[PDB]
């Protein structure tokens, strides 16, 4: 009894998309599907429903001129379309109804417009030193920059190393390619007797890099 | 239609307090047929669906800890946690179904902690950047409290505007502090037109602010 959107968007400006909500373990057409929108930071904005039994339709007033919702009993899914996409549509789409006993939500699906074209990163080192050392602490780390869409995956020494990692959310930069800083750290003493690994990967553009981090003397 | 105002939109609390938030319809969700509160509560963490806590304002669901509870009825409600856990950092959200859905604005909670300063680290460019064309000079504020902190690049002490972006960790459940890392990017005839880079940071927990500083071709 769970319902099952489809996956990660990423859509030019213009263009239109139809993201599907799947229902199972129970009667799809006895209960009102609604759909519910929630921009980046922001809060949860209800965009309407759907009667799945006569195909009845209401709408917030914000979405008229954006959203159609519809559904087929026949395979037992319903789905939002959002026509015209404009930057201001990234945002995360629920689909939810409602029960005697309880509420089921999708997972979410994201939809993300942007002009930008899929690139893969650079991976560049932070490089450790006096300036990255306080006491008996040292950070180094990794700066993977200009790539598009999201998301790039670090782990540090193949997965043998997770203390002390960390990773930034990434930052969306003027050109509309994203970039993000994934740091570690770690004991002061262990600089230059300890090998430090940022495995990055990028599966849009099918970028994987292996950095090696070595220390600077400064 | 039928407006939700919630309050606090931030709560900052420890571990084990009792946390209370508050959810106020513009009419009545007490529907006259079943005598039922149209009002649910939801947690939210980051990147997720929402989690249903409590619905008809005071049933709490099934899995749901014994900690949340709801209370409130007609227009006034009220969710509670009795004992605040580390996992409760979240936003917390109102929604009433009565009429088409609606929803508060949120209660972003976070754990109070003791004040900390940051660590202050700054990473000069690579060469392979630079061998690329361009110049990025990273500053770290590592296991900070509170939230706010301020960032500033100075380059040859000229304070920098529209070249830096910053982004800050969602806060940690183990020590319950935050990270930021800001990026400053310059082409590279631009970085080697200045000798020094420095990032200026201001928190609760320094005293003075502290400056992370290097010279170019220092290191």
């Known amino acids: 009894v769970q319902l099952v959107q489809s996956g990660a968007e990423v859509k030019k400006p213009g263009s239109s998309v139809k993201v599907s909500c799947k229902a199972s373990?129970?009667?799809?057409?006895?209960?009102?599907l609604h759909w519910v929108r929630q921009a980046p930071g922001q809060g949860l904005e209800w965009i309407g429903y759907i009667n799945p039994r006569n195909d009845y339709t209401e709408y917030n007033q914000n979405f008229k001129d954006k959203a159609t919702i519809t559904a087929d009993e026949s395979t037992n899914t319903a789905y939002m379309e959002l026509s015209s996409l404009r930057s201001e549509d990234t945002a995360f789409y629920f689909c939810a109804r409602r029960d005697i006993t309880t509420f089921y939500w999708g997972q979410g699906t994201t939809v993300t417009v942007s002009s930008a074209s899929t690139k893969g990163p650079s991976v560049f080192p932070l490089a450790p030193s006096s300036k990255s050392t306080s006491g008996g602490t040292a950070a180094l780390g990794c700066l993977v920059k200009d790539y598009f869409p999201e998301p790039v995956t670090v782990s540090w020494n193949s997965g043998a190393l997770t203390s002390g990692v960390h990773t930034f959310p990434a930052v969306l930069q003027s050109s509309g390619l994203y970039s993000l800083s994934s740091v570690v750290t770690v004991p002061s003493s262990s600089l230059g007797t300890q090998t430090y690994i940022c495995n990055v990967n990028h599966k849009p553009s099918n970028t994987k890099v292996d950095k090696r981090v070595e220390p600077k003397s400064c | 239609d039928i407006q939700l105002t919630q309050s606090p939109s931030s709560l900052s609390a420890s571990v084990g307090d009792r946390v209370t938030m508050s959810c106020k319809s513009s009419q009545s969700v007490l529907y006259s047929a079943n005598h039922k509160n149209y009002l649910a509560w939801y947690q939210q963490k980051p990147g997720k669906a929402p989690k249903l806590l409590i619905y008809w304002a005071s049933t709490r669901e099934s899995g749901v800890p014994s900690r949340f509870s709801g209370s409130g009825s007609g227009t006034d409600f009220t969710l509670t946690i009795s004992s605040l856990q580390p996992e409760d950092i979240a936003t917390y959200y109102c929604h009433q179904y009565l009429s088409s859905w609606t929803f508060g604005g949120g209660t972003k909670l976070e754990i109070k902690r003791t004040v900390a300063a940051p660590s202050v680290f700054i990473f000069p460019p690579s060469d392979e950047q630079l061998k690329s064309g361009t110049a990025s000079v990273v500053c770290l504020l590592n296991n900070f409290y509170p939230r706010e902190a301020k960032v500033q690049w100075k380059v040859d002490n000229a304070l920098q505007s529209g070249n830096s972006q910053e982004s800050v960790t969602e806060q940690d459940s183990k020590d319950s502090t935050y990270s930021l890392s800001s990026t400053l990017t310059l082409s590279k005839a631009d970085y080697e037109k200045h000798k020094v880079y420095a990032c200026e940071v201001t928190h609760q927990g320094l005293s003075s602010p502290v400056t992370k500083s290097f010279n170019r071709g220092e290191c």
């Open positions: 373990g129970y009667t799809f057409t006895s209960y009102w």
